[PDB]
Amino acid sequence: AALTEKTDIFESGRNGKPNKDGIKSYRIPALLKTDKGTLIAGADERRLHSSDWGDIGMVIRRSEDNGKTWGDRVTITNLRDNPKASDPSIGSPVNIDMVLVQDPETKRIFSIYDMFPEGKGIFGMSSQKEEAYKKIDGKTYQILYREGEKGAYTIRENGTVYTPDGKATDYRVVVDPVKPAYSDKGDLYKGNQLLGNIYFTTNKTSPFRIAKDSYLWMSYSDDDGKTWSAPQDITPMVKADWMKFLGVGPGTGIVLRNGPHKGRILIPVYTTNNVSHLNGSQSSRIIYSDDHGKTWHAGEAVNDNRQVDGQKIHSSTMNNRRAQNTESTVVQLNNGDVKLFMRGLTGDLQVATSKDGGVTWEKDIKRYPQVKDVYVQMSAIHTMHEGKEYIILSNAGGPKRENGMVHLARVEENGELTWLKHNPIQKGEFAYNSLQELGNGEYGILYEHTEKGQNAYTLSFRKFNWDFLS
Ligand SMILES: [Cl-]
Ligand SMILES: [Cl-]
């Protein structure tokens, strides 16, 4: 066989029950082959149910034998639940959806993922804007709102809470968490007494909360994924004042390997606006770093100044369901161009092109009727075989989220894509997935599937070779 049997990396419970570890659900795979040869498999650990909210931790497992066996779960981040929440299913600050990538110069490994305070995830965002940050004297601070008060408190040096007028208080935020899984992050103290947590939004025991908005956090590892930094809040570097949601397109990001922007880290993200939010404004873009992950910047949206049937749209003002593009996967070609394969609503594969290292996008989105898109996440990777350039892309074959496929395209000298093969890899339920090159003509994939009553989803791994592809 040219495809290995299914190995289950993150096992969900069955028939609506928790698994042996008390966890009902895993979702949202990310797969990363590191410079040491290690495979890191990431996921949402969704304890209480399968929905995009609740008690969710960012977790990884490591394989040191190319996916044959796997080590213990390592929790990158898991924010503590609000013990007073009326409904535990929506009673925790939330992390959800990660992107993994390694810097090939520094060997640092990044996991970038979404964060929401307590509530129904994205559906817990305030209906009206709540400002999340304020710049005071050239310094950007996260805002806190106090019960019964209108003004903006700020979290400054060492987590000290300042009044809206600019005076220090005896309140302090845990900004340098030290507990396992960093479960103490956001804890709110008055002197030495723990009062609550700034991410709690109901039945609060402390006076302070952050804006009910959408955030982006990053954790990094310098030891091949064994241990992880405390979360860094990168939101203010990349989130514009008009953006409602800003979140990752989960999977595995890339580092540009050629051209004037060689070394740039690219992370797929997408946004919504306040005009049409999730109904008509989901828009793909990337964020990037040119300094090995220290600072981040937003590129333009594919939808910015995009002409749709003779009239331009902009990601900040659009209201057009079919012009949306959401979670995406990013690839650089040998000619230096960046290709962004975007989940969307045309039924087929949508691809944007950037000639400037991901910052701006060409006028036209290219569609490939040869590859179905049933409106679900996908992953794609660059690969060379026998001196020829290809892209491998995996997603559901359909008609529903089912029949996982690995699609093989030749990259032409145009550089257009020619779809050569469409190979089934998993019968039955199939959703989010993440591909990696393993070396020696082999490839790995971590993907969502269920069978035999499993809760959505169990994340499984398979390896295949060139023979399987071609
Ligand atoms: Cl609280
Ligand atoms: Cl239009």
Residue numbers in the entry: 321 to 790
Provide the authors' original text about this structure.
Streptococcus pneumoniae genomes encode three sialidases, NanA, NanB and NanC, which are key virulence factors that remove sialic acids from various glycoconjugates. Although recombinantly expressed full-length NanA was soluble, it failed to crystallize; therefore, a 56.5 kDa domain that retained full enzyme activity was subcloned.
The purified enzyme was crystallized in 0.1 M MES pH 6.5, 30%(w/v) PEG 4000 using the sitting-drop vapour-diffusion method. The calibrated gel filtration suggests that CNanA is predominantly a monomer in solution; however, it is possible that full-length NanA may be a dimer on the bacterial surface.
